[model samples]
Target: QHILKNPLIINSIIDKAALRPTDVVLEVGPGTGNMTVKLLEKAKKVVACELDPRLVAELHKRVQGTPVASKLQVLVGDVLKTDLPFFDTCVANLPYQISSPFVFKLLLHRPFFRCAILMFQREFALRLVAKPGDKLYCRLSINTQLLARVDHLMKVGKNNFRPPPKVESSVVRIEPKNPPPPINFQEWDGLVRITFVRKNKTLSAAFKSSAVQQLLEKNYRIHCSVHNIIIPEDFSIADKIQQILTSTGFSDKRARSMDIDDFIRLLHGFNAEGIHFS
Candidate 1:
């Protein structure tokens, strides 16, 4: 268990949230209400999701006599399992374990929130903001970047927490992309999963795997069946795949150095060739 105990660092996180006077903020893992108390003072309301009931009690006691008591609402349960309520913005010291799923949940939520200012392990935070060709760039980087605008805020040293964590931490600001891209999320993710399997390898080599071809060919058959489209009797999945790679000039490209736009183009080229990946 860890709690952020430094007032300077706590206040800095709160400040970065940039809450509006009328905003309803969501705070996850509001341990003992240190940051929660400050959030209550600024926002119209603070809906906190905490896993432990004991901490919920402590949080209630901390705000018991204050006017901000009315401004706070605590949901005692797993933040991931709970059906999240509407919030204008999110500000929290996220538990490292739930960071990945929580991020996708936040991004995929409808009636979009404005932004999230969150603290995460420094390495995880670096991956979120990593650019193409960066050492940390991988499936997570591209997938997350496809849906949101992610930026690194500030780093917090290990000493900032009461029970110091073994790893250093950093804060990130994530704003969901409004009216997200027109591509099918499943299709986009499928393309990404394959290309990043061996991110450093050229796309030509990456797609040359028999397992990869089998899966893609299987999906192509399903797609054709659904649309009542006919495949040529002599159709060769490998040849078609190679033709797509060559025509699109993606055969020599490596997922490690390819940007989001390049991935989108490659996905489109595959679809045009009647190839499908999920």
Candidate 2:
């Protein structure tokens, strides 16, 4: 079910990845090596993370006695948790069910890749490249855009997949934006999570949100850990932080309406006031 049955689509993905002689690729869910063979031809090395033992055996046999055989390494495990080797490129006709977590995992991972050419459900693909004005834009869109640039390469029909899926698919390319903004990502993760608790709310209303009580309290604990800083308790601090945040001229701005750089500057505002969450 994970194989890319069409050769044209396979070749299209490889071209979009712009495979270089020095690239070490990490491919997940190599259903029957339809895409694997193509990658091995262009990449310096290829590592396949396949979970099924039967499939692993078949994959090995398929590549055996070929020039690409020596270039392929098949490992058995859940790719999501598997400690994969370093790679400069990722090209996969990913499992639709792992769409969300798999992409999120790749984004949060420490290493940087040149680009990821991944196939996703048409609806999800729209979200990945969605902009601020688009209704499809979400926290994921913002977060991914902040760390990397995403663009839709092409749309692939359901018929192109083996046993055809219920929905159409699209291929997207995500390349990390080099020289990332100077800010702690963990703390930014926390800030963005709190802000999007209610995506459209203005800062003025969001600051007093009782929904963020636990978040405020947790951030307080973190502040104290760094240097004995005292802030109000979870039950009593919603208004306290709201006043502080508002004093710094951040009252009407909305999280979704803000861009990545604004988000970074906003985090600095919080850090200046000692409301660190990481």
Candidate 3:
């Protein structure tokens, strides 16, 4: 397992979190417990969720005799499978393996957390913080931007870890929007999924892509949450979708070229016409 070994790098992560004295933290993937030690010092409570039995026992042993032991509680369980506890803040040098779904899980978690300072694969970090016209922009970028404001904190070198992995990493801070967005989430996600079929392709062209054609013919439906999505044999649905794109001021725009507001307008256009992107 790759463990964070550099002290200076560890301190930087803690500073990025801007830990409050009263803040209770939900930490992700505490492999070596170095960062957890500092978290215990700053936060009123530190809940480190560790899944591996070996590390869990070792972490418990490591913190047992420490002064901050009482403040740190090591919960042994897979974060994805277990119900997460309430916390005011989140800070972690997240394992690259669980980056996508786990990050989204925290971003969309209810009783929302104040902010998350997370380390991610450099490429994935770019995807998270990318804007329209940027090559990294895609469904992940749009979906993340919809609910949270992302900040690229800094780039972390591969040498910062013990038995370092092949890729580089970057730290980012995400603060969820106070009121969230006006568009319906289900519709937004479904449409985002569809647009991602060919992120570089235009909306109408995206539907006709090989992946989408398979989705339409083999599945007979494009519905994400409901069920099957039936397309008319004449493919008039494509034309209607194109009209929706034009009406929404997104005729030639590809997903990569569309910003958050662009997505909002597009989502509304699809919703108004009872179009589901699956």
Candidate 4:
């Protein structure tokens, strides 16, 4: 039977991390303590967050007699939502489905972890490290790279796992950078959500929709002046609107996409224009 456990890959992760005796590591989705055992060797403490109740029980039993048990602390809950106490670094074989959201959550929190070594689906690994302008480098790349430096570490064949997945996987090391510029998290999230909601429409055209307009005015105190703006397929007019905002010094070209600073600037500009929706 194919199982999620892969010793070789797990060992490789530890070697790559070069865990130090002083390091405190956080492991997400530590199914059965396979990787957990390895992390405990060099780490002063290992905090393993697992979601499955059955596995948590099993893990408790598995670690009962191991040498690393004293250094391991297993939490039963969703790592994405759980409070992962302070740590020096992170190492995990993440559940593939939660990889993107989990990564974003960590980035947003500005954790103190110096580095993270994670395994993800191969395609996702490439996308995480993808540079601007690359087809694979869309929202994920922009947001991730804005905070940390990503490096592709290694590739794992599907057969490496007990119940091998149809697709391949890869390891990536992400080192969080020093404090980033302050950003408005809500505005950044809202802007990205709105942009995707109207991906095919021009910026002005997208804002023309009553629902979107209402959202902006209600939540942000920003009102759109243009009415019935046609959303072209190519949506080149969006670029024009961005230019207008930038030239006015009310917003910057970065706002053309979405950035925390840009959104705040836009908010200030909206207030200056005396624009408000009833």
Candidate 5:
């Protein structure tokens, strides 16, 4: 279905958000205001951002006669393209295609919200909450987990929707880690990308490739230049990469089995050597 219409499921989503009357909630892709009406009932104010004009009009009409109408603010346009406003929490039945980008956007949002209760395709939700060693785990699981505490809330059968989508859906609660980690996310992700290229390969084996060496060397050169540090003529980035791996005892480690702390330790090791990833 284009919109989530099940009353019980809608209430369950609101319940999981644990909304406070003083909280301002952000709802994305609020088609025809099914959940929007309920969100308005609970929160102090609701910011309903919808892409379709018809749905926006329908939403306005749905709340037109009520006292809560004034508490509603409708932003009509593509949610990804629009600048997000301040809100205490976000509750949405997100479009599946925009799920990845939207998750990152919310995590990066300023004046961080308390938590978010969001719906996504079942597989995507599984990936969000998957542990390092799980079959669904990959770069997405690691990257998202690094920034937030993600938990799987509940599952909804396809029949819950009006038209009944082909795929099942699941709700996830994401609470961004307040005062996020000290490392540069761009740099961290870069290292992660390299390791996950062949997740089953040992760090030593992965780092030995010419492709990985050239990329890291280029990044290293840029880092050196930025710091006004001269590169030694005897310097070999490939050798440095190997040295770091061996010294840290991660030479035989594989990305698939590595946890957040493991990756953090590896990152610190690389930074100590002035071998930047980004």
Candidate 6:
């Protein structure tokens, strides 16, 4: 439990969460009650979501008779689909496998949590806080940063774990923004996934294929209609084919190479031309 034994790291996470006496904190993957103890100390309520039934029972037993027992509620289930009760902050050492999906889900669903202090594999943490042209910057970076401000907190070595992982880990703070601007979310998501699939090719080249074009048109329809936009009537198959081709920066670069702003601009251009999720 060396990983769980790092009191310095745990305390740092709690401090960053800025837990008030009245705050409700959501703890994901609270294995062995390490971080949970600290969270319960600062926050009025702690909702500990644990996936392992064994761990859930252990947590319940460990907290019994403690002053914080009344404040801790352990649930045995997957955090990904569980109903996230009211909370003002989130703190966790997320399992590696579910890191990407869990973060995205949190962003998309947007619980009342003001900030999330999470520990992730070092590479993933860097990617989340990566800048426009960095090697780690990709769709995940764009999407995550689009809704929140990311900051790198600290780094931990592989030796910190009992059965140490192959790589190092880092802590990150994600503060969700208020009123994340309204965008064609579906269209943007489609564009991102599609673009990444054909990352090495030009957007036009990627869409020129019958399979790709059909898919794009299908996904772009819903986005198109919602905005009351119309695809160009005179636009020929060839013209539609050339749209991604004539584009400059993005055309030459792969989707992974483009930044959030680039995706935003491309989607805006595409929507302006009445192309969208169908």
The prediction achieving the highest lDDT against the true structure is 1
Best first by lDDT, ranked: 1, 5, 3, 2, 6, 4
lDDT of 3: 0.80
**Candidate 6 overall Cα lDDT vs. reference?**
0.76
Poorly placed runs, candidate 2 (over 4 Å)? 207-211, 230-236
lDDT of each: 0.90, 0.79, 0.80, 0.68, 0.89, 0.76
Q: Give the TM-score of candidate 6.
A: 0.87
Off by over 4 Å in 3: 209-235
> Which stretch of 10 consecutive residues in model 5 shows the poorest summed lDDT?
50-59
Clashing pairs in 4: 2-162, 2-163, 3-162, 3-163
lDDT of 3 at 132: 85
Per-residue lDDT for 64 in model 3?
Answer: 88
lDDT of 5 by residue, 131-225 (tens): 98888778899999999999999999888886788899999999999999887999888889888888999999888878888889888888888
Each prediction's RMSD over C-alphas, in Å, is 1.6, 2.4, 3.6, 6.8, 1.7, 3.2
Which tens-of-lDDT digit does each residue in 1-278 have in candidate 3? 67888889989889888998999998887887888888898889999888566888778788889788888877776788778889998987777678888877887788888999998989999999888888888788888888899999999999888888789989899998877767677767877888877788888776666665554443334342354444556765556667887777677878877777777787778766656543
**Lowest-scoring 10 consecutive residues by lDDT in candidate 1?**
50-59
Give one digit per residue, the lDDT tens place, for model 4 in 62-169: 778877788888888767887768888888776677889888777665456888888898999998887644556556665677677899999999888867788898
Residue 19 in candidate 2, Cα distance off native in Å: 1.3
Write model 1 residue lDDT over 1-278, tens digit each, in one string. 67889999989988888989999999988898889999998999999988568887778999999888998999988788888899999987877888998998898888899999989999999999999999999988999999999999999999989789999999999999999988788888888988899999999988888888989989999888999999989988888888999999999999999999999999999998788787
Residues 1-278, candidate 6, lDDT per residue (tens digit)? 22456777677778888888999888887888888877887888999888666777777888888898999988787788877788788888877789998887777665546888988998999988877667676677887888788999889877767678888999899887777768766667777776766565666565667766677566556665787867677646446536644653455666656777777887777666666643
Model 2 scores a TM of 0.90
